[PDB]
Amino acid sequence: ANSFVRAVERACSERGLRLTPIRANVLRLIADAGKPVKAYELLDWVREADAPPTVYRALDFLMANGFVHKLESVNAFVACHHPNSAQHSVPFLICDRCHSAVELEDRDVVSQLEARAKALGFQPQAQTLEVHGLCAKCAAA
């Protein structure tokens, strides 16, 4: 949480990149929210000021390096729970009702879909895998 930035902070020294204060505050804000964050919410909270395109390029950096995931079906961002997995494709369980998002890791599923793609000549690079339905709390309500 507060430590998580520090963990990401040395995942960047350890390769070409560096975590500017702006990237750290964006990362910290997303990690602290505990539901997926809309881009306009992140700007609001980073104004608690930086020009907006500065925060948007900090967000791009976080995404290209796999520290933040964009959830395509809700158009919202979440911090990667394990950050030095480089960039990676993983399933998310996204509750329809409370909007929580849980990040899994399945290499069998991603490998199967790669094989499916390559057997039709498609050269596959990043997969969007989002499972919808209800989390345990909401299903029990």
CA gap 58, 8 in Å, rounded: 14
Strand partners, 94: 101, 132
Judge contact between 27 and 8, C-beta under 8 A: yes
13 lines the binding site for a second copy (CB under 8 A): no
128 lines the binding site for a second copy (CB under 8 A): yes
135 lines the binding site for Zn ion (CB under 5 A): yes
Q: Between 19 and 80, name the residue whose CB sits nearer to Zn ion.
A: 80
- Is beta strand 68-71 parallel, antiparallel or unpaired with respect to 76-79? antiparallel
Number of residues that bind Zn ion (CB under 5 A): 6
Helix axes 21-33, 52-64, angle to 10 degrees: 70
Confirm or deny that 132 is annotated as ligand binding.
no
138 lines the binding site for Zn ion (CB under 5 A): yes
Site for a second copy (CB under 8 A): which residue of 15, 18, 72, 87?
A: 72
Q: Between 60 and 72, name the residue whose CB sits nearer to a second copy.
A: 72
Q: What is the longest distance spanned by two Cα atoms in the chain?
A: 51
**Amino acid code (one letter) for 54:** T
**Restricting to residues 26-55, which ones interact with Zn ion according to CB under 5 A?**
none
The residues of the shown chain that bind a second copy, judged by CB under 8 A, are 72-73, 91, 93, 95-96, 102, 104, 106, 108-109, 112-114, 116-117, 120-136, 139
